[PDB]
C-alpha cells in the first residue's frame, strides 16, 4: 500500500511548484525594492571636457555644472556631445548612453508590417529584377565594388497612379528584403515652424549613419520635397529651405555608408530640377492583359470557388486594372456572391464586379502626369 508515496509525491510537487513561483515572486519583489533603491538618473549633457575629470556640463533641462564620471564610463569615447547620465547627489556622471532616437523615427521605423515576398503584384515582371539590381546589390555585398570600385548610389524614384501598387511595391520590398526599412512619408513635418523639419531630418541622417545597412523609404514627398519657387508663404520658404538643406545633406561632407533611399509620390513632377538629378525614375507600368490576368488570378486563389471562373471573359472585360484593382474585382465578385450569401464564386460575380469597377472608373479623370 504505497498510497502515502504517490500522495505525498503529488502534494510535494504541488508545494514545490507553488513555493518556487512564490519565492521567485518574492525575489522579483525585492528586485522592485532595489528598483526603488536604484533611483532614477537625470539625463544631462556634458558641454565640454575641460580635463580628464572636469567635464563641463549643462543639465539638458537646467543650469550648467562641471563634474566627473563614476569609475569606468570610458572617457575614451566620451567627448562633448555624447549623452550621459548624472548622479542623484553630486551630479557626477554615472553612465553614458547612446543618443536619442526622436520618436517620429520609430513611427517611420517600427510600423513595418511583415507580408508577402516579391511575387504578389504583377505588371512589374521585368521591374522585379530591376528593383533587385539596386535593392539587393549593396545589401548582398559591396565587396564587388572593391574589384570594380563604383561608389554606391542612394536610390531612385517611382511614379504611377495613386495606391495602384507603388504603395504595394514598397510593402513587397519591405516584407522581402527585411533589413532596415525606415518607412517615412514626410507628410506632416512642417507644422508651423522653420527648422524643426530639417532638424529631425538631420537626426534621421545621423541615425542612419549609426548602423550600416539602413534603408530609407520616402513616399508622398509632395509638400516636402517639392519645387523651389520665388519667396512664397513663410511655409513655402521653409519648404524650399529644407529642400536646399536636404540637397546640401545629400552631398554633405562624408559618405553616408550603406544607406539606400526610396523616393516616391503620386506626382514626382512636383520636385525641383536642382533635386531631380535618383539614378532613374523607375515606373510601375500599367498591368496589361498578361499582368492584369496574373494579378486577377492571385486575387482569387483562396476562394471557395471551382474550376469555373472564366478568365478571358474578365480579361476582355477590362480596360486597365492593377493588383489593387483586380483585388477589388475578386472582392466585389465575392461580395455580389455574398449579396444573397453565395459562399462560392462564379465568374458571373466577376462580371458583376467588372460592372461595379467600371462604374467606379466614371469617377476618374486626367490620370497621368509625367515627371522630369
Amino acid at each position: 500500500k504505497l498510497l502515502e508515496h504517490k500522495e505525498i509525491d503529488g502534494r510535494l510537487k504541488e508545494l514545490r511548484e507553488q513555493l518556487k513561483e512564490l519565492t521567485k515572486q518574492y525575489e522579483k519583489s525585492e528586485n522592485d525594492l532595489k528598483a526603488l533603491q536604484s533611483v532614477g538618473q537625470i539625463v544631462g549633457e556634458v558641454l565640454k571636457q575641460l580635463t580628464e575629470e572636469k567635464f563641463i556640463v549643462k543639465a539638458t533641462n537646467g543650469p550648467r555644472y562641471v563634474v566627473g564620471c563614476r569609475r569606468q564610463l570610458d572617457k575614451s569615447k566620451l567627448k562633448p556631445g555624447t549623452r550621459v547620465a548624472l548622479d542623484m547627489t553630486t551630479l557626477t556622471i554615472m553612465r553614458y548612453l547612446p543618443r536619442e532616437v526622436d520618436p517620429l523615427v520609430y513611427n517611420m521605423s517600427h510600423e513595418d508590417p511583415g507580408n508577402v515576398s516579391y511575387s504578389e503584384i504583377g505588371g512589374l515582371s521585368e521591374q522585379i529584377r530591376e528593383l533587385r539590381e539596386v535593392i539587393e546589390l549593396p545589401l548582398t555585398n559591396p565587396e564587388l565594388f572593391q574589384r570594380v570600385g563604383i561608389i554606391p548610389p542612394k536610390g531612385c524614384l517611382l511614379y504611377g497612379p495613386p495606391g495602384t501598387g507603388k504603395t504595394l511595391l514598397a510593402r513587397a520590398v519591405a516584407s522581402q528584403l527585411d533589413c532596415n526599412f525606415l518607412k517615412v512619408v514626410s507628410s506632416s513635418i512642417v507644422d508651423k515652424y522653420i527648422g524643426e523639419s530639417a532638424r529631425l531630418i538631420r537626426e534621421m541622417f545621423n541615425y542612419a549613419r549609426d548602423h550600416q545597412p539602413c534603408i530609407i523609404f520616402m513616399d508622398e514627398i509632395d509638400a516636402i520635397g517639392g519645387r523651389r519657387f520665388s519667396e512664397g508663404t513663410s511655409a513655402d520658404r521653409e519648404i524650399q529651405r529644407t529642400l536646399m538643406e536636404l540637397l546640401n545633406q545629400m552631398d554633405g561632407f562624408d559618405t553616408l555608408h550603406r544607406v539606400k533611399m526610396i523616393m516616391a509620390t503620386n506626382r514626382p513632377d512636383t520636385l525641383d530640377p536642382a533635386l531631380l538629378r535618383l539614378d532613374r525614375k523607375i515606373h510601375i507600368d500599367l498591368p496589361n492583359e498578361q499582368a492584369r490576368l496574373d494579378i486577377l488570378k492571385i486575387h482569387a486563389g483562396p476562394i471557395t470557388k471551382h474550376g469555373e471562373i472564366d478568365y478571358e471573359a474578365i480579361v476582355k472585360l477590362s480596360d486597365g486594372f492593377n493588383g489593387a484593382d483586380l483585388r477589388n474585382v475578386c472582392t466585389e465578385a465575392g461580395m455580389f456572391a455574398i449579396r444573397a450569401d453565395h459562399d462560392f464564386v462564379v465568374q458571373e460575380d466577376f462580371m458583376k464586379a467588372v460592372r461595379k469597377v467600371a462604374d467606379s472608373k466614371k469617377l476618374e479623370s486626367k490620370l497621368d502626369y509625367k515627371p522630369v
Partner: protein, 54 residues
C-alpha cells in the same frame, strides 16, 4: 558685476542672478567678463571663471 573685493553680482544659469563673494586669489583682472564662472551649488561661492563654453 563686481561691488567690492572678491565679491560680485553674477548672472546665474539656474534662474536667479546673485551677488556672491569669490575666491580672492583669483586675479582681480579676470572677473571682468561674463565668462564661465564656477561656484558651489548652495553656497554659490565663486571658485574660478572659465573662458570658453558652448
Amino acid at each position: 558685476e563686481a561691488v567690492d573685493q572678491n565679491t560680485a553680482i553674477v548672472g546665474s544659469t539656474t534662474g536667479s542672478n546673485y551677488y556672491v563673494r569669490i575666491l580672492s586669489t583669483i586675479d582681480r583682472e579676470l572677473l571682468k567678463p561674463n565668462a564661465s564662472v564656477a561656484l558651489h551649488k548652495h553656497s554659490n561661492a565663486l571658485v574660478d571663471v572659465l573662458p570658453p563654453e558652448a
